[PDB]
Curated annotation (Swiss-Prot):
Transmembrane annotation, as ranges: none
Comment field on protein domains: The tandem Agenet domains (AGDs) mediate the specific recognition of the histone 3 lysine 9 dimethylation (H3K9me2) mark.
Gene Ontology biological process terms from the UniProt entry: DNA methylation-dependent constitutive heterochromatin formation
Tissue: Expressed ubiquitously during vegetative stage, in meristems (e.g. root tips and shoot apical meristem), and in ovules and young seeds during reproductive stage.
Gene disruption: observed consequences: Abnormal transcription up-regulation of some transposable elements (TEs) and of hypermethylated loci (including MU1, GP1, SN1 and ERT7). Hypomethylated DNA CHG and CHH regions. Reduced H3K9me2 levels. Increased ratio of decondensed nuclei.
Residues of the full protein shown: 205 to 352 of 517
Name of the molecule in the record: Protein AGENET DOMAIN (AGD)-CONTAINING P1
Organism: Arabidopsis thaliana (Mouse-ear cress)
Taxon lineage: Eukaryota, Viridiplantae, Streptophyta, Embryophyta, Tracheophyta
Length: 141
């Protein structure tokens, strides 16, 4: 968050994230939809996958402008390589991680620093990591 500009980031969130806007909300990114902007900096969002305790009602939460972003653009022809920063769809969310072993029988070996564990993920649940920075998509530094 030395990459982003607070002022720009706030303005751009206020521009793009209207009611009904499909977004991701923050280590891990969860699919969600804007319910309504709140204040000048916050957004009430409804999670696509996360649920309240009953496992039925969608979880709703307030998030700030620094924890929301558009869905990233997709790539289908992804050539995963060792060292690549990726997201893995894990526990209803896209977890940041690293490729530690290339593709084998449709799966990729993944490591998560956040929980210090490694496992394989199917290629359906994998994407290259991308940073939303001042209204643009940037690849990792």
């Amino acid at each position: 968050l030395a990459r982003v500009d607070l002022e720009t980031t706030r303005a751009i969130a206020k521009q793009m994230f209207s009611s009904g806007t499909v977004v991701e909300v923050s280590g891990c990114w969860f699919a969600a939809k804007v319910v309504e902007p709140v204040g000048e900096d916050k957004f009430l969002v409804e999670y696509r996958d996360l649920r309240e305790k009953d496992g039925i009602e969608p979880l709703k939460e307030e998030t700030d402008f620094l924890h929301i972003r558009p869905p990233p653009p997709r790539d289908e022809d992804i050539d995963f390589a060792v060292g690549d920063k990726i997201n893995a769809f894990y526990n209803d969310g896209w977890w940041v991680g690293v490729v530690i072993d290339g593709m084998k029988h449709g799966t990729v070996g993944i490591y998560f620093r956040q929980s210090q564990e490694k496992m394989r993920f199917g290629r359906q649940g994998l994407r290259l990591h991308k940073d939303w920075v001042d209204g643009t998509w940037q690849l990792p530094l």
